[PDB]
Amino acid sequence: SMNPPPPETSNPNKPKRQTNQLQYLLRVVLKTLWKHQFAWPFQQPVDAVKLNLPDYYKIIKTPMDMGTIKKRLENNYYWNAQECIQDFNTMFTNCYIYNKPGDDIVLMAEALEKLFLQKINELPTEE
């Protein structure tokens, strides 16, 4: 099985805006998670070919990853903070669905999710 193309990240038929919360989601939330010691399995789409996981896209139909989230923020793909927050949550949920409890990858996702939830409790004020 081939990999699917990565999720869309820059769509010129979507309107674009800068907001306090979107800027914080890139500069603080994404940045803080990206630097974590266990972020690396989440910094790009799952390469099912390279990783020999031929059933990955048979099970996960809404893939998401921080590399895609980063590019979506950089190219104004999101209009509302909730869209970005939803993508981070989809990333974590996919990890929990595909893998088993206690697997190294799941323990890594749990550590990142704890940090994510802390940082999104500190969003700046909305316009």
Ligand X SMILES: COC[C@H](C)n1c(-c2cn3c(C)nnc3c(NC(C)C)n2)nc2cnc(N3CCOC[C@@H]3C)cc21
Please give the C-alpha separations between residue 20 and each of 72, 81, 122, 125, in angstroms, as whole numbers: 16, 9, 12, 7
| Distance of closest approach, residue 63 Cβ to ligand X, in angstroms | 8
The three-class DSSP label of residue 87 is helix
| Distance of closest approach, residue 41 Cβ to ligand X, in angstroms | 4
Contacts of 5 (CB under 8 A, 6+ apart): none
Looking up tokens 């921080």 gives: 66
State which of positions 66-95 bind ligand X (CB under 6 A). Answer: 95
Choose the binding region for ligand X from 4-12, 40-48, 82-90, 111-119 (rule: CB under 6 A). 40-48
Q: Is 46 in the site for ligand X (CB under 6 A)?
A: yes
Q: Is 99 in the site for ligand X (CB under 6 A)?
A: yes
In the complex, residue closest to ligand X by CB? 41
Rounded CA gap, 80 and 120, in Å? 14
Residues that bind ligand X (CB under 6 A): 41-42, 46, 51, 53, 95, 98-99, 104-105
